[model samples]
Target chain A: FVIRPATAADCSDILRLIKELARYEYMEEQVILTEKDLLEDGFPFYHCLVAEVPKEHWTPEGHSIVGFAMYYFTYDPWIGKLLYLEDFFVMSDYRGFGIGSEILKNLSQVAMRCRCSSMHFLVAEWNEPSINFYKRRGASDLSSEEGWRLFKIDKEYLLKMATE
Target chain B: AKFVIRPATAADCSDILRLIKELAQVILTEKDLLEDGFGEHPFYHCLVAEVPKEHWTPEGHSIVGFAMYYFTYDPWIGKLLYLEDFFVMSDYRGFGIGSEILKNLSQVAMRCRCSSMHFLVAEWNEPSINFYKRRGASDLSSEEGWRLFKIDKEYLLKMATE
Candidate 1:
């Protein structure tokens, strides 16, 4: 298996992985992004890396994309730049082969290259496997310590708040 | 005692840094602000509250507050406008500046076509909590609050080079 930076050509495959992950998470209906959206609207906002398998492992379509990691820079006034991992997914069949960790390491390299002081991401409460993975990597649980809840104003509420 | 809410420019970096330090209670320099907010790969954007010439402080500073944000993606909601910092100088706090800043930023997020706007509020800050709820914000309290994890530079590099 090889891990490499994703290009526009990988947009369709990346979107497929996004959908698969959403399905696994049981949020399948939320996978509204199309390949065009990924290439046009999403590229300017984020960066992604993909993992590829050898020809022997390729599917009938002759594609080898097995996993991906998407992220972008975030800033903390006190800490300066941080790398936010928006999505990190590896195909279930390929999960145990260390591809996830390698992808994470690559992301850290990108963080260093970007001059970020740290890396941050969120894990769902019930996602024990991911929680343990992050813990093993030396991540801290800021939610319990700081009571940092995630609040949102959706488009409907945001527009209302904006106009009224 | 009036102010205009406008998009921040390169010239406002110094004042922006000053206000960031004031809010963070820690020292941060202008270069930090400029690099993150104005450089080619900007990680954050800012909106400043600028007072008129007559209202400029003795230090010749006219900026009273700022709202800084960055783009975040929500799997369920698509794109999000994550408000990282929202602060109004203490002297100007009660003049509805905070609300105005929020209003302007909400419009900014809409213009950018974000699916939602998100931010965190201190649990102890009841007043701020009330401000958000009164404006129709949903608090994804503890049960729904995903745990935020972080890995610092030392550890990050260690893992990368391992």
Candidate 2:
């Protein structure tokens, strides 16, 4: 297995795993990224990374991408640069063989090379397995530790706020 | 003069860093700000609020309030503006400057085609919470029960080598 930066050729696999992650999060109903939007708005906008495995690890169909990690750069103000990890998922059949760490190691290498202060992402409160995994990897639960809470104003209000 | 909002200049780092945190300075410096936001390929965006000299100190800068943000993307949605730090100095609050800052921030979101504006608020900050709620913002964590996580730089570095 090998990990590499995704290209337009990987957009199909990228969207496939995006929805796959949505299903895993039980958020499949919320995914809105279609093929058209994937190529047009993706790429450098979101650094897409994919893990490719051999056909022995693949399915009967043309399934080469086993997993992916998505992230983009943002500034932390206090912490300087930060890399925001938006999504990560490895297919069920491909687990328990170090693929996850390989992907993470690749991501960390890029982040450090870029001099980012930290890597940030959101996890569901109910996700104990994933939570413990990150914790074991030295990630902090900022919400529980720092009393931080995320807030948002979606497009409806985004457009509404434009006038007021 | 009326309250004014303007893009932060490289020279404005001292005042910007000051407004960022009055006594909260455990880390961060002007040079860091210069490298991140004021550099050629800026990674963040900032705007400072100004009042007339009559409202300023003799040696103090006129840019009392500052807002810091970065353009982030939501894979499901489109572009997004994430507010990292936003404040008008405590002494300068309640004079309509905070509202003006939000108005300007809202315009930045719209003009830049951001799908929404996002941020984190301390759970103890009731006043600010109510302020944003009244302004049509949603506490996504409460509404969605999502939690924020972080991987410190040390761990990221360790992962890189291990």
Best by lDDT: 2
Top DockQ model:
2
- Candidate 1 residue-wise lDDT, A49-71, digit = tens: 99999998876777789899888
Model 1 Cα lDDT, one tens digit per residue, B87-121: 98887777777878888888888888998888888
Residues A67-160, model 2: lDDT tens digits: 9998898887667888889888998888888898898899899899989878999998898988998999999989989999999887677666
Q: Assess each prediction's global lDDT (C-alpha) against the native.
A: 0.83, 0.83
What tens digits encode model 2's per-residue C-alpha lDDT throughout B1-162? 367889898988888888777625337778998988776678888888888988884566698788888888766666788998888777788787877777788888888878789999999999989988887788888787889999988999999998
Q: Clash pairs of candidate 1? A: none
List candidate 2 segments past 4 Å from native: B23-25
- Tell how far residue A1 is off in model 1, in angstroms: 1.3
